[PDB]
């Protein structure tokens, strides 16, 4: 049960329902709820009082997810105290509830079975891009072992105009495969006939262990980032600084003095400032022509863009913004701004890894527009499954879908046309159109046992 009809609850309510699982969402906002009722049972809820919560759920019994306005927990306790509902996931944003998580949560006091701390997820994610220079976006699936890494094709690049299969004739060291191609905002599924044009998002597949190795074999692993610049003093700005001052030369820009002082107190080895983001003097005076990346983490998405647009004009090697609402990302990305990050496309990314656990499909982090990458599980021996033993090239997959890899236990087999799908595999594939999932969900799913 979802206690919200927000972009999180709505994106779930759309993504999770394939009749594979059944849920009931709660929201006091009727115009948005019956809008979210399209995507399913609605239990409009007066401030998470028990009559809603347990009757909507605990009598029927199903997993509880609470994402409403504030962090202050009360609803998960109302579900745990008098009903004993299991597998409760509750988003908690405010740091103080995180900073003492160990005291509170590993004592079992609060009943959160699994946390979804947005500031934590986004700040960890941004450090994951910095670590592999040249990576636009990194895609994470339910299986930690496999992950996609995306690059940008330019003039003079090793990958422009070349034939896809022309790279498939050599398999040097660790190997890759192009699972997706995004250009001009709209999706192109990879084919043998497709050519890599300029300004593309070439999404390579790579085993999570050896990602850096993949990018250096394609000559795209630039020199490690050294000098970083940030622009946000909020929950994400301080967390990122507290994570990068030990390994990277950080500079911060905060426009509220009383907060700029505590950032000077909380960050020992960082230089925090007091200025507006578009203060041309401050950016020049503080050596912006030698910046390698210009992370922008503000409240208003307009400000992140109009400052990160300024700071590639001056001379930063790269730029990153934080488009708060997550439905926009692919529209400002590419071109002048190299990377755009979304917290509500990362908070939802973690929720579809708990909900989908043990299910037929796991929805990847690569959801942009209609396209989404998914990970499908093949159960059952050759007697109770249409897709087991059959070679990849011999599967009548729905249109646009293309298998990119296969995860087996703890090793990643790149999908080749000559590969065999064995039982209990986690197949990683790229859907160009997401209206086809219950076709895949019906193909891989084992027949009655």
């Amino acid at each position: 049960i979802i206690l919200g009809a927000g972009q999180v609850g709505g994106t779930l309510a759309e993504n999770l329902v394939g009749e594979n699982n059944d849920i009931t969402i709660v929201d006091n906002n009727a115009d948005r709820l019956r809008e979210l009722q399209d995507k399913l049972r609605v239990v409009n809820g007066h401030a998470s009082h028990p009559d809603v919560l347990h009757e909507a759920g605990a009598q029927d019994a199903d997993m509880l997810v609470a994402v409403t306005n504030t962090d202050e927990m009360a609803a998960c306790q109302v579900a745990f105290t008098l009903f004993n509902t299991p597998n409760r996931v509750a988003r908690i944003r405010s740091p103080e509830y995180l900073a003492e998580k160990e005291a509170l949560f590993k004592s079992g006091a609060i009943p959160v079975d699994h946390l979804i701390a947005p500031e934590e997820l986004v700040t960890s994610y941004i450090e994951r891009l910095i670590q592999y220079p040249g990576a636009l976006q990194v895609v994470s699936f339910a299986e930690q072992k496999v992950s996609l890494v995306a690059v940008k094709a330019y003039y003079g690049g090793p990958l422009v105009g070349n034939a896809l299969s022309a790279l498939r004739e050599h398999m040097p060291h660790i190997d890759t495969r192009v699972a997706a191609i995004f250009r001009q905002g709209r999706p192109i599924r990879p084919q043998g006939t497709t050519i890599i044009e300029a300004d593309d998002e070439v999404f390579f597949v790579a085993a999570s262990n050896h990602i850096r190795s993949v990018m250096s074999e394609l000559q795209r692993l630039e020199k490690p980032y050294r000098r970083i610049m940030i622009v946000g003093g909020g929950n994400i700005g301080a967390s990122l600084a507290k994570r990068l001052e030990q390994t990277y030369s950080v500079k911060l820009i905060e426009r509220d003095y009383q907060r700029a002082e505590k950032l000077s107190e909380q960050l020992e080895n960082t230089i925090v400032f007091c200025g507006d983001a578009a203060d041309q003097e401050l950016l020049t005076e503080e050596n912006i022509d030698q910046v390698d990346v210009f992370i922008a983490l503000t409240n208003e998405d307009e400000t992140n863009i109009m400052s990160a647009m300024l700071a590639k004009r001056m001379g930063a090697k790269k730029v990153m913004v934080l488009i708060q609402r997550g439905a926009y990302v692919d529209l400002v990305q590419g071109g002048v701004i190299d990377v755009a990050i979304s917290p509500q496309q990362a908070t939802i990314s973690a929720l579809l890894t708990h909900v989908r656990r043990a299910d037929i499909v796991n929805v990847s982090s690569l959801r942009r527009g209609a396209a989404e990458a998914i990970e499908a599980v093949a159960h059952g021996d050759e007697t109770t499954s249409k897709v087991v033993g059959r070679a990849i090239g011999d599967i009548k997959l729905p249109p646009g879908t293309t298998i990119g890899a296969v995860v087996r236990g703890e090793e990643v087999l790149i999908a080749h046309d000559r590969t065999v799908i064995e039982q209990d595999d986690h197949v990683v594939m790229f859907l160009v159109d997401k209206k086809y999932v219950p076709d895949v969900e019906a193909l891989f799913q084992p027949s009655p046992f």
Binding site: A30, Q37, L40, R41
Partner: protein, 479 residues
């Protein structure tokens, strides 16, 4: 827009034809009857219903909803006349037939056939069957498709009224209200039907009068409604099966949700709490006026006759088990005014349902209080929480439209040669879906002029559709 609509139309015409089979089956199980027009109609409609939707099987998806439901009755009402036109046994004209077709389907109950006692037992089933069909039609529409439209008139109807009490799920509409409500409909028709058998009358009259009381129609297989057998049981069954069938069916949904926990669901609904008082005070005052007048020799008959007439006229049922012989002239008029207070909303019922009257009485007294305390803040009590100013407006525009139609339809019947009194007695009987003319033993709908019977059809729809549904058809904004 119009394309997928004609798909719906021809689709329903086919379903109507499938209904024609059940009458003719009776005209062969019985052979006191003529069945060929039903089987001639079954074919001709199936063709004319199929011919429209075959080249229109193209599927596509508010302006849509208003134009459907005027076709649901216009088309089905016209098609209903066909059996009467063909058969020579009635010897009924076209307008008399279109009238009897609409009067049946609209659950009105106003007839234009003299001496139907000895008419065939096959055409006698079709009249009551059409009331049953229009009985079901109003239920699915009023509880489900109509409220969405914005003229729900069901509890706090306005647009948003998604199942009212114990409204859980409710995501499937019409389709999760046509299936579930049928069980109440069938389980109520049979209960009365066998009850009439236990009263003693023939299976036919037992059954074909159940199709009529439950659908709040008022038809009969006898010229006199329930004077054919002046037995307290039949009256006391017809009384109790009109009171039970008149109330909100969304409250009759208090039996299919975890068994019989009725009384809490019923009594905590203010419409049912006002349906009783209005029903009691009516019969109560219609009784004391009979006892003071010695209209009937023994106060048991007076009780029988009164308690049936107030609950057959103020529930829009339209059954006459008397001739108002010993009744004051001043009693049929009062009963006719009580027709406007039809059955509870969400049920087969007349014009200004109890809430419309309940809301009207509530709001009208608030305007009397504010006259002394102008700076006070007042609210409406009906439900748990006071009504939105949209709903209070949606009753007071409904009264206005009602007395706007009722006057134009009156000066339209006057012109065709009727008299002032008979016009009022007619439109108040047809706009409210009542049936009997009422007054000092007056209207017989055969005497009505040809071009008035058309206006009457024009009117009985206006009452059956919530008056606005058809009033907006002639607006410039809709088109």
């Amino acid at each position: 827009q119009f394309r997928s609509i004609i798909r719906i139309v021809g689709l329903l015409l086919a379903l109507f034809s499938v209904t024609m089979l059940a009458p003719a089956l009776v005209a062969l199980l019985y052979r006191d009857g003529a069945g060929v027009p039903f089987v001639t109609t079954f074919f001709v409609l199936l063709f004319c219903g199929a011919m429209c939707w075959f080249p229109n099987r193209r599927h596509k998806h508010s302006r849509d909803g208003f134009l459907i439901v005027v076709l649901f009755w216009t088309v089905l009402g016209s098609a209903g006349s066909l059996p009467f036109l063909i058969a020579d046994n009635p010897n009924i004209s076209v307008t008399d037939a279109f009238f009897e077709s609409f009067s049946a389907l609209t659950t009105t109950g106003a007839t234009v056939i003299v001496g139907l006692d000895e008419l065939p037992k096959a055409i006698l089933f079709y009249r009551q069957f059409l009331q049953w069909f229009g009985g079901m039609g109003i239920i699915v529409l009023a509880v489900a498709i109509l409220p969405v439209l914005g003229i729900g008139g069901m509890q706090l109807y306005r647009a948003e009224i998604p199942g009212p009490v114990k409204d859980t799920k409710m995501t499937p509409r019409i389709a999760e209200t046509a299936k579930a409500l049928w069980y109440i409909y069938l389980s109520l028709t049979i209960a009365c039907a066998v009850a009439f058998w236990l009263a003693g009358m023939t299976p036919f009259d037992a059954i074909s009068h159940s199709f009529s009381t439950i659908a709040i129609g008022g038809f009969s297989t006898h010229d006199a409604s329930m004077g054919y057998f002046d037995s307290y049981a039949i009256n006391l069954i017809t009384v109790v099966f009109l009171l039970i069938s008149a109330c909100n069916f969304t409250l009759h949904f208090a039996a299919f949700a975890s068994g019989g926990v009725h009384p809490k669901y019923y009594w905590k609904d203010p419409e049912f709490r006002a349906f009783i008082f209005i029903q009691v005070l009516l019969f109560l005052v219609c009784f004391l006026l009979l006892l003071k007048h010695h209209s009937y020799t023994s106060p048991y008959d007076a009780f029988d006759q009164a308690l049936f007439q107030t609950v057959s006229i103020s529930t829009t049922a339209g059954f006459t088990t008397t001739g108002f012989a010993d009744w004051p002239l001043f009693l049929p008029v009062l009963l006719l005014f009580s027709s406007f207070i039809g059955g509870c909303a969400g049920s087969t019922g007349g014009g200004m349902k109890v809430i419309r009257i309940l809301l009207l009485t509530l709001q009208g007294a608030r305007e009397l209080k504010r006259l002394v305390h102008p700076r006070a803040v007042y609210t409406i009590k009906v439900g748990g929480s006071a009504l939105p100013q949209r709903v209070v407006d949606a009753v007071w525009g409904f009264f206005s439209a009602y007395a706007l139609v009722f006057v134009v339809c009156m000066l339209g019947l006057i012109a065709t040669g009727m008299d002032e009194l008979s016009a009022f007695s007619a439109v108040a009987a047809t706009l409210n879906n009542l049936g009997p003319g009422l007054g000092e033993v007056a209207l017989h709908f055969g005497d009505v002029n040809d071009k008035a019977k058309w206006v009457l059809i024009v009117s009985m729809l206006f009452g059956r559709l919530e008056i606005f549904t058809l009033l907006i058809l002639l607006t410039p904004t809709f088109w």
